[PDB]
Symmetry: C3
Subunit: 341 residues, 3 copies
């Protein structure tokens, strides 16, 4: 029985940016058409140049953020070009049935498949590859995961009948990586994903990542690729982790409204310091910037953040508010008449 709705093709963009979309809409349901192309490739994952045999949707870690509204249909063309070596598929945590779509999307190199799922559940959700058995964790921790956001047609709200609107949106995908080391402790390089598998599985079994990165590599979202904002902007930060828990924190800020389980049928929590993304989920936080300067966005296992790669920066333009915070006295020698014991 053919589905007779308007069709809209969406052009995906690389994270941490997001394709153009409406928050609130008075459009009715549409068939929203997306294409994802699997790419297996070697990628650089840290500031010392360590390489890694990655597997990706659309060439990025994370895969791109897809944005639709409640009641839309999502028609995904998944493509596995013949230059790839492995079968792949896709599981949407937003979707109902057939292992999230994985049981309908297994494609060999040289094949494509078209899946349609109805967006009946609001929130941010993980999507990931899941070919079967031990291949499931391996494909996910090799980079084959992203997220989808299903907005209410009226946009976000505070759970108390007040509209919330973001000025800007970023998608932070966090990736735990398991890179083998040689006897001297140096990271090993491989010529293919298959050649890396046996040694990688041994690291995976001990459940301790070697790297924890945002946007696919240590330092990806620092320096020139810091995330921009302005004082007064309400920024939505979508965070996903397909395999392992995370505890996001905006250093110098807060989560004004946080959906840490990521589902917009639930009222957000207010005024959080640190929130929790359970492995296998996406969450989202709104924050209105009140001060200019550098902010560090981390997982608040600080060892992970500083030493394994999991720090992003915001660079925020505007005027400093000395009422909220001020340096009353700059660093100075301790007065000779001081005690301090």
């Amino acid at each position: 029985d053919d589905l007779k709705l308007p069709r809209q093709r969406v052009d995906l963009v690389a994270p941490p940016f997001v394709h153009v979309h409406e928050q609130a809409t008075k459009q009715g349901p549409k068939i929203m058409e997306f294409k994802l192309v699997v790419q297996e490739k070697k990628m650089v994952i840290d500031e010392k140049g360590t390489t890694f045999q990655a597997m990706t949707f659309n060439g990025s870690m994370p895969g791109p953020l897809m944005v639709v509204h409640e009641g839309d249909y999502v028609e995904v063309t998944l493509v596995n070009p013949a230059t790839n070596t492995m079968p792949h598929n896709i599981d949407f945590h937003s979707a109902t049935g057939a292992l999230g779509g994985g049981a309908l999307t297994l494609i060999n190199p040289g094949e494509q498949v078209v899946l349609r799922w109805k967006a009946t559940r609001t929130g941010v959700f993980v999507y990931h590859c899941a070919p079967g058995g031990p291949m499931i964790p391996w494909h996910v921790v090799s980079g084959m995961n992203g997220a989808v956001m299903v907005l209410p047609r009226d946009g976000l709200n505070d759970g108390h009948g007040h509209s919330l609107r973001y000025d800007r949106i970023y998608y932070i995908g966090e990736q735990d990586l398991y890179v083998p080391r040689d006897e001297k402790g140096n990271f090993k390089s491989y010529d293919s994903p298959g050649e890396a598998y046996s040694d990688t599985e041994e690291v995976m079994r001990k459940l301790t990542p070697t790297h924890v990165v945002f946007n696919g590599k240590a330092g990806a979202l620092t320096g020139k690729n810091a995330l921009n904002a302005n004082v007064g902007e309400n920024v939505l930060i979508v965070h996903s982790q397909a395999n392992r828990d995370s505890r996001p924190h905006l250093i110098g800020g807060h989560g004004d409204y946080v959906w840490e389980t990521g589902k917009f049928s639930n009222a957000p929590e207010t005024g959080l310091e640190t929130w929790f993304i359970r492995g296998g989920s996406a969450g989202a936080a709104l924050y209105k910037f009140l001060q200019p300067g550098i902010y560090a966005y981390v997982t608040h296992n600080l060892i992970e953040a500083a030493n394994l790669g999991a720090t992003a920066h915001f660079k925020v333009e505007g005027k400093w508010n000395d009422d909220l915070m001020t340096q009353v006295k700059a660093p100075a020698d301790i007065p000779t008449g001081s005690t301090n014991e």
Copy 2:
């Protein structure tokens, strides 16, 4: 001052099934009588046949689910037969005082004890052995844990004054295990729990399980022992973890109503993808099945799920709903006129 209420003896059943009970009741408070018999025994824990020196309530990992109503008294006879080697006791997280009952239930082999506790707190709760000191974690991670559910007398509700009723209930106990390996990496076998202790404690101290299993072994709830359901059934899934965090996910489904901290005085969250069972707790999720087929129920550390044992299956009978999900085009060769870069 004798307690003059009606008495009701309950026959426990092995997980993942649950003894017969009423959801809503107009019976008044009763003294609900349960018996738990400690059994120390070697058990098989994985598909390669690895054995393990287990310690159990009633011969199973997890121990059986006990179900009562708010205001009931729970009178537990704990039995430690003389074939066992160790003292044991029981701590109910549902109970008030004396370390949950552990300080009133320490029994040597050849002894039994009778504890009564009032079910003043609604929810699902862990129970576990806790003899003292380093024996506490060792007995728990050797299998001595289960759960109890204290229903409201009116049954479950959505926290917004609507009744919720399940058609079916399953109890998923998740167990982290710490099995020693020899120099070549093979799992070691022992002739008694005491002989296994020193080597096991060394693995425990590094806080990384060798196995993470549902119902006591890898594959316990797959194949012929898959969990049955039907399209349209509302299924309650109780999940416990006495020692370590878990992140349950129903692959191809959702949590319609989830009490992730497990306590029915709190409204459930709606429409979750993945929830979080904090170590030392039980939680519960309702889901109404909408699609037939195989579902995988996992902890969404996919390494744990696929490679350390933590996958169950549901086999769901009914009619496929192509409105919720459909394969628009089956796998096919990528069209020669395609780009895809």
Copy 3:
């Protein structure tokens, strides 16, 4: 533009105790003045006498609890005496801007600095040192963390318009420690924090603590330093963890009202068995004691609690309530006419 409010100097006290304060107040906003003095020193961290090169605020792990009200200004003098070897600073998760104050408070040995921040967000919050880069996790896991509580001016409430008042307050700071071992497995000793750094960073990178302690050492809050209470008292337990998740549980009790994300703009959850402190946060639980005796307060990874140091005790005076719990029959030989199979 000078801030013309009354000033009040607060004398901090060592955890787990808390400086005197009012819960509800009709005082207007004040400038609340605190002093923190960094102390680097060797400390004993376990019952076998293992030493550790610690770095502290005010000589304690955790640093002391600071208590203010919503709308107060907090003026902190941070002092780094010239006997210390390292630069230090302070980041308040309660504060807005400049990395929580860290970007305005970096002081060398022999210097002090004065920071003022407005307490615009209610809750319990972590504070910690964060000098920059890999020094951030190292200073935090060396002991440089504490907490601040920002009460509503009307005191706590249940989120349903009922006042909650505590009779007693304790602050439990949990610390994950990473102590190097020699080839034979013995803990290594060092003559300075700098000498310990390289070996410590190697342990930190594997993300598995050697010790998990409350109030700075295994057994700190047991024996003669058990926490006192009485039957009928409502006790607030503030719990912080600056780097790593925790799952608090009061053995033999409950959390009557729990703010596990720690922020008093959110209604507490009721009747919890175990709650969850995400690393990089503080939470709080109220409990009204109903039974006398010993209670153990743990993180409910029982391996951490029993074997790595993370157990406190409450000693509760009062009368036992046999309605809530009773030993119906003391331990006795299993009757000869018993079955039990």
